[PDB]
Amino acid sequence: APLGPFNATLLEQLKNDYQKGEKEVTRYIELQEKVAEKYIKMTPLSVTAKKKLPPSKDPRDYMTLSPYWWPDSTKIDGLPYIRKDGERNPEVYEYPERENANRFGDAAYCLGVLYYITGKEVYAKACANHLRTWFTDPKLGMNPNMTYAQAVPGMKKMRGSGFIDSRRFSRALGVAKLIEGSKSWTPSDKKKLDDWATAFCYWMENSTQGQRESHAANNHGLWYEAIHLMVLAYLDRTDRIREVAEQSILPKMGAQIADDGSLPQELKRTLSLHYSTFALEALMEANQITSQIGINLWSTPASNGKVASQAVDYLYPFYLNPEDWKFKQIKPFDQSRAAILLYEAGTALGNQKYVDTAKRIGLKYSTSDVETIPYLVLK
Amino acid sequence: SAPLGPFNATLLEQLKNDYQKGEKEVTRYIELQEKVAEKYIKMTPLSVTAKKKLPPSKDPRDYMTLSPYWWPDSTKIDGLPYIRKDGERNPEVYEYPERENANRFGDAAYCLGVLYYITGKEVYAKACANHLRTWFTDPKLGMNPNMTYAQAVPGMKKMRGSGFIDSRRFSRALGVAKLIEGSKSWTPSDKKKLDDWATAFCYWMENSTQGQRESHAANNHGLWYEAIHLMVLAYLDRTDRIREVAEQSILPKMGAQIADDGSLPQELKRTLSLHYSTFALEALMEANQITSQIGINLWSTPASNGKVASQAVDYLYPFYLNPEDWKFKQIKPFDQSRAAILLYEAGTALGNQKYVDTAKRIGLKYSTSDVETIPYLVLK
Ligand SMILES: O=C(O)[C@@H]1O[C@@H](O[C@H]2[C@H](O)[C@H](O)[C@H](O[C@H]3[C@H](O)[C@H](O)[C@H](O[C@H]4[C@H](O)[C@H](O)[C@H](O)O[C@H]4C(=O)O)O[C@H]3C(=O)O)O[C@H]2C(=O)O)[C@@H](O)[C@@H](O)[C@@H]1O
């Protein structure tokens, strides 16, 4: 498969078996084609579809509210907002791109993967429509920055913590490599998206917000580099991917994993089991890319000898029994998120206990959740 | 006497008295509240018709919301029919603007009407009136007097009345409209239109199939149904019906829901059992605010089966002290601050100084903008 943000091994196996006419896969792909129809008809979304504008006055600037910040009832204007870790302020849904970036990302991802497997031009054409409108359109496309992502009313300093929102559209950016060579994705479309991705990569690496997020001591730094790798892989910068793995990702794992394999930065969160898992999901998506060029982030040690497999080891019994978790978790943990994580970690590590547990937890055969498309093996 | 309505009339009268006498503590408190209220004077009045997606009637004046715990079924091609996940609010609810707009309207009308009652300044009646007219009686912007499409569920075949509980967000504003009667801005015509609207809503809640079913609910929905019923009846000055509902429906319903140890078994089975135990009692609390103004104390009056609502407070009191001690399912954190007004209301109605003391110890923030706390200087 082309370099991108997916399990390349599972995708190739699906395309092989679908082209071979294998019955199990052909039936699974035909279900996925029924799921995917809503995306062929779906009107492409745009970040410009908001009423309340950013401080730049530019509807093309992405802006969201940082989810745990709330009006202060003891202030006349509610300002400045105050933090309630783990309590999502429903005001976030007043920023349309919060859910629209997810909807776009789901649509482009599903369509791009279904085009790669089946070769049907109708999937590239619709995938292309979503990509053009979201990224490159001179009126509807988003500016390549995350300046106003997770803004906070009344906050005086700028932060880069909102960059983590980018994972919702950076996976779709990656899957665009899958429609290159279709009739619908012209050389001109590719150049524009290449140029947008080049400007976004530049902003990520050189803006102050980008630099600060690249140095975050918790799961934000890990997601920053996972996003970084999707952009770099889209741009075919294989040397930079190696450099990011060795100079940023591995040192981060070495610092954030304690000797017992816990992630202390996530243990202090009110949703500590969710955020431990979310840290590892960043590594999981990062590894999907690094493992396509021979770097296994699950088993490759940092300079201090720590390996991401130690973090999985620490959490595994709590994926078996979340009720055993001893740290603060003020909402129930969704065990299903462990399925893909334990499958990904298990195959990379040769740990059949992890792979077995992934299949016992399982994914629903008929689920329309787009990230589960490659994982027939769990269905 | 304050007009009959959905508030602690004793505290409101105390506030108006002291404010008019010029007592310093109250005058300063009311001047804070006037600063808080300023946003409501400037606020553009909201309307249920400010939606894009219409209800099956095709009428924008029909209130419509999504039942909050119903989610798309990802294993279905269309996500239909939705499935229930108790206690997990589907953010799709925020796609129905009247869900939050009913709250915002309710807050503004409540705050402004109470501030007019306390202070006598016409500017509060005038703004309160603007919000009431637009929400209720306006021939284009006012809501139709029904809750047919409240908490609808995609793909569900049966009609339900469970969405009626949404009405509490605007039924308190309806009640407070009595406080601006006699202002210059609230004309005789305004009163008649709202009287007529309230009559039609009372007819709908009592005679529609959805209203009848909700009136028979065996959990907190039945309690809130009667609390809402009382707000409407008190607005309409139907004191004989208030007595009848208190004696023939609320007290038997309340007695039926209290187990021998004072627990509320219907609420213990919920994923948010401490929230819904508290929510059941808040219904009784607001109902008692109306019944006690005509001599019926719902906290201390036993039902005919011998249960009394004070038993339910007794069961929950130690867990209001220490919410972490709660042993039943509570998949989100419980807000202890909700115990403050509840224990003060029950504590005063019962002469229980331990409840009142704890209420003041938990307390409310002196400067909070939460409009339901306006009468509770005593806790601030
Ligand atoms: O978008 C979502 O709704 C949600 O996103 C994922 O969780 C994210 C949040 O979006 C958000 O960015 C949050 O950031 C936290 C975090 O703790 C962050 O490191 C930083 O912490 C600050 C904070 O001010 C503290 O008080 C302390 O001083 O440390 C600071 C620091 O610099 O470390 O900011 C806060 C915050 O603003 O709340 O957590 C994110 C995360 O940790 O990834 C995720 O839950 C996802 O499922 C969901 O989609």
Ligand SMILES: O=C(O)[C@@H]1O[C@@H](O[C@H]2[C@H](O)[C@H](O)[C@H](O[C@H]3[C@H](O)[C@H](O)[C@H](O[C@H]4[C@H](O)[C@H](O)[C@H](O)O[C@H]4C(=O)O)O[C@H]3C(=O)O)O[C@H]2C(=O)O)[C@@H](O)[C@@H](O)[C@@H]1O
């Ligand atoms: O509006 C909110 O977001 C929220 O409202 C308050 O909680 C309300 C909910 O809005 C909702 O109506 C919910 O109804 C429950 C309840 O359990 C009810 O009895 C009924 O239950 C049905 C259901 O079919 C079950 O599957 C079972 O068969 O029992 C049935 C029964 O009739 O007993 O409907 C469900 C449901 O639709 O989810 O709970 C309400 C309540 O208990 O008052 C409240 O949380 C408030 O703070 C908040 O504003």
